[PDB]
Every structure is written in C-alpha cells, then in structure tokens.
C-alpha cells in the first residue's frame, strides 16, 4: 500500500528500528509496517488493549505488541491535544529495551520503535505529529 | 506498491543492503528507497553532482550520498549503451566500505548498495539491467 510511504517517513531520520500504521476501528489490523519487526505481527486483540476502555489494566498486567512483552510508561491516548502513549519493551534477559511511542488518529494508530539507546521524548513527538497530520486529513 | 516494487526487485537476490529509485528530471528527488538507509537521504544537490556536466571533479573530490562520503571508481553515466557509475563509500577508520552502482534511464536513476564483501561488478550489472529495462519502457 501507499501506507508504506508513512512507514518510510517515520523511518527516515535513522532513529527508529521499526514503524507501523495500524487501524483500530473496523479495519482493526496492521495496514503497513517495517518487515521483520514485532509491529508487523500486532494482532487485533493487542490493538483492543491499546485503545480500549480499560486504561488501568495494562499498568498492572503489561501488554504485548507482536507477542513481545512491553510496559506502559505513560497513557495519554484519550487526552485531548495529545493522543499518545509511551511504551517500552521488556528485557527478556538479556537484551536491551526499546522505547515505543503510539499516536492515535481517528481511524489509525501510528507506532514507532526507537533504536537501542534512543529515548522516548523524540519518539513521542514523532508519533504525535504524524497522528495529528492524519487526524486533520480525516484519518 | 508503486516504485517500491522496483526497490524490492533490486533487493531480492540478497546481495544488496539498500536500493533506491531517484528522479533526475521534473521530480528530482528520491521516489522510493530502502527505509532508514543512506539512499533515502539523497538530496537534490547530490543528484545534481551525479548527473552534472562535470565528470571529473568527483574523482579528485569524491561525492556524498545522504551526506555519506563516497569515492567515484568509474564513470560511464553518459556513455551510451552503458549509463552506469561505480561508487564506493569511504572508510573513516577501517570499518567496511560498500560498493554502490548507479544506472541512468531517461527520467530516473537506479541506486544499489552492496552488502559487505559484495563486489562492484555484479552491482553494476544489476543497475545496468534495471536502468535498461526502465529506458526500454520509456522511463
């Protein structure tokens, strides 16, 4: 799809390991994602956890993306003028952790994962700005 | 998919670490490229150096692609029946360098970068071949 161009855009600055555009409404599945990443295997039930009414459970139980265990660092997904969440992978041992930001537009979610050592502020701004762009275009 | 399919054809035999399709006429910018690599960052000014009238300065001076310093190994971009160039990244402290081949069709340039150890000859054939296909197709 043409949605791969959005992945390209999110990857262009070299600070992200992967990116994705994911529907969360009727077309509740991955629309475009970096190949070989965890984002490409995000599932509808994982999407429901990100966007659902319960904004508490994931603090207690974590969540997964592409079956990868993660922690929720900040939830502003339904905060007007923000519409982001900050996430971090869990270290199975063993391996570095990676920061994840999610931006919520009207129809789609924007996911970015930083490379090793890339902090979450810059990622949040990226997710925010793209989700805002998409909201204003009707998405 | 659009021009992404051409990137994918360039990448599918495994010898490359990135590829790109780049216009040099009306739309003088990158059209499709491996996400998060060097080629996606090629600038119009760098395009102008690749396709410009001066075919000698870049031997003495090198050139950049995506701000990465490179050497010109062979220039045949305006040799009819060939229309390629051979380029190599420069090492700053002994880290590996990579070969780059460029093919020029009528409207677009084909860029390919080898994996470590991949020689320029096969890359040149790849770039030649795709640029010839595009040329024969009116591009």
């Amino acid at each position: 799809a043409g949605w791969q161009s959005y992945v390209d855009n999110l990857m262009c600055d070299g600070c992200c390991q992967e990116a994705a555009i994911v529907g969360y409404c009727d077309a509740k599945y991955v629309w475009a994602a970096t190949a070989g990443g965890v984002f490409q295997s995000i599932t509808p039930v994982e999407i429901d956890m990100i966007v659902g009414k319960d904004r508490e459970g994931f603090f207690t139980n974590g969540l997964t993306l592409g079956a990868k265990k993660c922690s929720v660092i900040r939830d502003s997904l339904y905060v007007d003028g923000d519409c982001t969440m900050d996430i971090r992978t869990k270290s199975q041992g063993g391996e570095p952790t990676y920061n994840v930001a999610v931006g919520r537009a009207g129809r789609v979610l924007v996911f970015v994962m930083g490379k090793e050592g890339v902090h979450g502020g810059g990622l949040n701004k990226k997710a925010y700005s793209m989700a805002k762009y998409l909201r204003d275009s009707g998405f | 998919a659009g021009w992404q399919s051409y990137v994918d054809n360039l990448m599918c035999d495994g010898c490359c670490q990135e590829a790109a399709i780049v216009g040099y006429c009306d739309a003088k910018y990158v059209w499709a490229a491996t996400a998060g690599g060097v080629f996606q960052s090629i600038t119009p000014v760098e395009i102008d150096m690749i396709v410009g009238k001066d075919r000698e300065g870049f031997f003495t001076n090198g050139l950049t692609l995506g701000a990465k310093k490179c050497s010109v190994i062979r220039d045949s971009l305006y040799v009819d029946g060939d229309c390629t160039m051979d380029i190599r990244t420069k090492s700053q402290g002994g880290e590996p360098t990579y070969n780059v081949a460029v093919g020029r069709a009528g409207r677009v340039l084909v860029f390919v970068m080898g994996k470590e150890g991949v020689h320029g000859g096969g890359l040149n054939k790849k770039a030649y071949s795709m640029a010839k296909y595009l040329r024969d197709s009116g591009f």
């Binding site: 799809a1 043409g2 949605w3 161009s5 959005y6 855009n9 529907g23 077309a27 629309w31 129809r107 762009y133 998409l134 275009s137 009707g138 998405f139 | 659009g2 021009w3 399919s5 051409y6 054809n9 216009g23 739309a27 059209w31 409207r107 595009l134 197709s137 009116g138 591009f139």
Partner: peptide, 16 residues
C-alpha cells in the same frame, strides 16, 4: 483499508 492522504509518475509495468 482506504488510500492514504498525500504526504512522482506511475511506474511502468513489471514483467508477468
């Protein structure tokens, strides 16, 4: 899924 908003000429066909 719907086509995206704009963020290049159409390519020629590939073989096959």
């Amino acid at each position: 899924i719907p086509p995206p908003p704009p963020l290049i000429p159409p390519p020629p066909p590939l073989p096959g």
